[PDB]
Amino acid sequence: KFPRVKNWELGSITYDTLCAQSQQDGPCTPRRCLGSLVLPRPAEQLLSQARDFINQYYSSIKRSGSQAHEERLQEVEAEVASTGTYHLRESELVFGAKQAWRNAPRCVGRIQWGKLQVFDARDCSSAQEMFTYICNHIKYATNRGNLRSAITVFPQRAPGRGDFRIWNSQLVRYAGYRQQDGSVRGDPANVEITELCIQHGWTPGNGRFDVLPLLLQAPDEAPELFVLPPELVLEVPLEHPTLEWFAALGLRWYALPAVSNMLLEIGGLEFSAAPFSGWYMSTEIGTRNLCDPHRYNILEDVAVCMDLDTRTTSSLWKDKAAVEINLAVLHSFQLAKVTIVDHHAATVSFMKHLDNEQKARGGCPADWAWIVPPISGSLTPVFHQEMVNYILSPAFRYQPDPW
Amino acid sequence: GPKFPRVKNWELGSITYDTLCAQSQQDGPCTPRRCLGSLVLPPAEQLLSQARDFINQYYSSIKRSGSQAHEERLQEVEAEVASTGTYHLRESELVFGAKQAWRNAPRCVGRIQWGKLQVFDARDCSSAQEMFTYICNHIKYATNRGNLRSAITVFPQRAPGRGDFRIWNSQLVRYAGYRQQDGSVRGDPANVEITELCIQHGWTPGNGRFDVLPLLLQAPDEAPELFVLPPELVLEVPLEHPTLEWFAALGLRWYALPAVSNMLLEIGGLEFSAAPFSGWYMSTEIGTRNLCDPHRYNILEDVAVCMDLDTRTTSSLWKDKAAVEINLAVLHSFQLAKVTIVDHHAATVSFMKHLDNEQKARGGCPADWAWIVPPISGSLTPVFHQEMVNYILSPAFRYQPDPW
Ligand code: HEM
Ligand code: HEM
Ligand SMILES: Cc1cc(N)nc(C[C@H]2CNC[C@@H]2OCCNCCc2cccc(F)c2)c1
Ligand SMILES: Cc1cc(N)nc(C[C@H]2CNC[C@@H]2OCCNCCc2cccc(F)c2)c1
Ligand SMILES: C[C@H](O)[C@H](O)[C@H]1CNc2nc(N)[nH]c(=O)c2N1
Ligand SMILES: C[C@H](O)[C@H](O)[C@H]1CNc2nc(N)[nH]c(=O)c2N1
Ligand SMILES: [Zn+2]
């Protein structure tokens, strides 16, 4: 029942016992594995998730089974029985947010899980106020380049109404403009969201790196548009340690990776706007953002600058240009004094996290295909590490686009 | 949407549904509670139903399902089982089944070539010495002086109460790994045990990093016998770099023929415990895994020092830079020597084409994403962006316990 987990570089073995705490099914069955898929295909239930989560909280502060634990369980029962829902205490919300990050199987940054600033924005009643919270979050998290993990939590979902939602997938994203010639200027991942901004009254730029405005939505209201003041949005010009021409490419990226469209689930309560940020691992920018063919797709441009032979796969021009771009990202961030981690350092620290979690919890849910970096996979220790993937709560989830 | 897994390509935005998985009759390790896809290792009644299924596959493949010859073959199979407990394949059925087992292998990126496989029937083999003759013929044919050709040699199947035909070596060609007094390993550390078994069984060992191992071959109920491959049969490629002149001075080399020799071939309930198969290398197998794994030759640091990189800090990407050059050295050296090899870009491009072929022909293709994606430059290849469904179809190759 408990799976054996082996590391093939070192020959070491552990057993995951934590997986038995899973209450939520993933996409696999004994007939077929679907672990490579990106997205997923009443009082009694809420009450039991609420109890489990409260048990988790009192166990975390070592006060499991005390009177405060007992009376808090009664408070939750009393509230659900009367209202069909309940509310979290602030410190509970703080615990739940850290735990949702801890439990995220696709996150390689989890050694940092215990260090998270939690902003309680549950007293927010308008899109305008959402914006103020978001701006303070950005300023805090950015901290002049010395990035600090943060989450801001807007009011929970309520059965009698529409959700608070941030329409953007990230707080900072570059616009993508579809052209008459069918190409895309800017970031092709953000075409649809750029078009929505324009529909809701934004005057668009014409650059490759136009920071998008935010579409913020209070319950049952049309989303409202807010331009982030450019002084809040820290960006890094990309240059190269040895290649002088690289800077001429005019490439840049923003400092703050801040996911804004996922749902935060704690004790059966759902927070549909709960944006969170940390700092980048270099491959996210250098490899995926700039090199993906359905993104900025710069590989060929860069290789031609390097005067590589582009005529054939076997000169490994792609691999060569990809390394230089990742190096440029590392160099430029370090030069601009902005927090960044390379994929070797991050995966080493992830291995340590796995060992920490083994001792603490008897395992760690991990999604191998997301943990292993998108260049030089087997050069990192996580490649050689077997991993068990499963869903624990508190959790982050995907949710439908609100349009 | 259809009641079958939906499979997306995220580069292109295209969708398919896998209906082939419905044909799987064997459970993998995953459940609704937990995914275990990253784990490397996983009577007459049972046999008869596997047999019937295989015979139906055979007759469907020649477009003769339901026909007299199909029903007669079925009757023939159950009569043979009813009186002996086993049965035997016709020659053309073995050929079909071998190719099908390769086509069904979820972890193989080379499957576009599945229809082109030379199937050597060695089901008459009766000694360890004859296994050696068969293996030498396979190696010569497959190597073809560098113009490599896919091949499989099939020795006799498991029989009840009778011992197995086994090749102890994991591949027909492997380098020795000698444990040193300083605790280190000279040669390939993956091969420490088999090397030590060969010496026990009377091999006089070398003292190099690239000593070709002898074969340990086991006929039914006999102790295994040792056979040295005549060196003229084992094609090897000395490694050099196109621009970095000192690379050749490292004395690195690899062999031409990747020939897996310890896997079990299952066809219709029948188990062929000895059926070595071979193709040609994808360059990352050698340049990235065999040469750069910390637990293999582990040459990353040596090469990066030669390249004069800053090995004191992760963020110089010294590991990534050296790896790329080692991989380019592998491609270049194999090309120069005119030995068949394919890079990870061309290999994955042709695997996508294979996925498209199989969608039309069978309605899906079992594929293990973590194995299909190459170990350098993953997201630079098109398979990274392709969702995959993994399941077990039969005929199949299986891992089997080491015989010692
Ligand atoms: C502190 C620095 C952090 C680093 C270096 C980091 C790194 C990463 C990486 C590389 C991924 C895979 C993303 C992709 O390639 O699409 C990821 C995913 C994820 N991270 Fe982290 N992360 C950090 C902080 C955080 C924080 C603060 C949270 C929440 C509080 C978080 C929650 C998540 C979640 C839920 C995912 C999965 C999202 C998805 O499926 O796209 N991470 N992270
Ligand atoms: C024609 C050129 C071929 C290429 C380039 C190729 C490539 C590969 C690669 C890269 C793997 C992943 C293994 C690893 O990295 O450890 C693999 C696995 C596999 N291949 Fe292929 N292959 C070829 C031919 C064949 C042939 C002829 C067969 C058998 C008839 C075959 C059967 C298998 C099987 C059963 C596996 C999974 C077993 C394992 O190694 O774990 N391949 N192949
Ligand atoms: C907090 C944090 C820090 C960090 N360094 N990195 C991250 C991952 C995000 C940024 N770099 C990529 C990830 O973006 C998150 C969104 N995931 C993209 C895949 C996806 C999801 C849902 C629907 C789709 F259609 C597609 C988070
Ligand atoms: C026929 C063919 C052609 C080709 N290019 N490539 C191949 C795969 C083999 C060679 N390059 C790596 C693979 O070797 C397969 C053996 N390893 C499987 C994993 C494993 C399991 C148990 C214990 C272990 F130590 C390792 C086959
Ligand atoms: C299809 C496949 O699952 C998809 O391309 C995944 C693979 N691994 C990944 N890993 C990370 N970290 N981020 C990603 O976006 C993806 N994409
Ligand atoms: C832990 C993980 O399952 C293991 O290291 C796998 C990953 N992917 C692989 N992919 C291939 N092609 N070959 C391998 O040996 C491995 N090793
Ligand atoms: Zn699975």
Swiss-Prot record, chain B:
Annotated L-arginine binding sites: Q171, W280, Y281, E285, N290
Binding site for (6R)-L-erythro-5,6,7,8-tetrahydrobiopterin: S38, A370, W371, F384
Subcellular location: Cell membrane; Membrane, Caveola; Cytoplasm, Cytoskeleton; Golgi apparatus
Coiled coil regions, renumbered to chain: none
Region described as Interaction with NOSIP: spans on this chain: 34-404
Highest taxon, organism lineage: Eukaryota
Positions with a binding annotation for heme b: C108, Y399
Amino-acid positions noted as binding Zn(2+) in the UniProt annotation, renumbered to this chain: C30, C35
Subunit structure of this chain's protein: Homodimer. Interacts with NOSIP and NOSTRIN. Interacts with HSP90AB1. Forms a complex with ASL, ASS1 and SLC7A1; the complex regulates cell-autonomous L-arginine synthesis and citrulline recycling while channeling extracellular L-arginine to nitric oxide synthesis pathway.
The family this protein is said to belong to: Belongs to the NOS family.
Free-text function comment from the UniProt entry: Produces nitric oxide (NO) which is implicated in vascular smooth muscle relaxation through a cGMP-mediated signal transduction pathway. NO mediates vascular endothelial growth factor (VEGF)-induced angiogenesis in coronary vessels and promotes blood clotting through the activation of platelets.
Protein name: Nitric oxide synthase 3
Species of origin: Bos taurus (Bovine)
Part of the intact protein present: 67 to 482 of 1205
